[PDB]
């Protein structure tokens, strides 16, 4: 199947439009400054909202070298 994603025309922060940046796996779009941390520039790649970046349910890379 085709990954026909959907993007909100309203920011998840203030439900306003304009300069939006939408998540890959989540339809939410945000305003650059409204985000936390706020984007000053558009990221190249699969961008994820705060919830997604916090959704590291799996092992967060155990760096026990000792």
């Amino acid at each position: 199947g085709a990954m026909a994603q959907k993007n909100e025309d309203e920011c998840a922060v203030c439900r306003d439009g304009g300069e939006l940046i939408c998540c890959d796996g989540c339809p939410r779009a945000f305003h650059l400054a409204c985000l936390s941390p706020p984007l000053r520039e558009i990221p190249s790649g699969t961008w994820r909202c705060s919830s997604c970046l916090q959704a590291t349910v799996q092992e967060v890379q155990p760096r026990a070298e000792e």
Partner: peptide, 10 residues
């Protein structure tokens, strides 16, 4: 990023 440039609602 899935960037959009819609109309501002304000």
């Amino acid at each position: 990023a899935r960037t959009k440039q819609t109309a501002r609602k304000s």
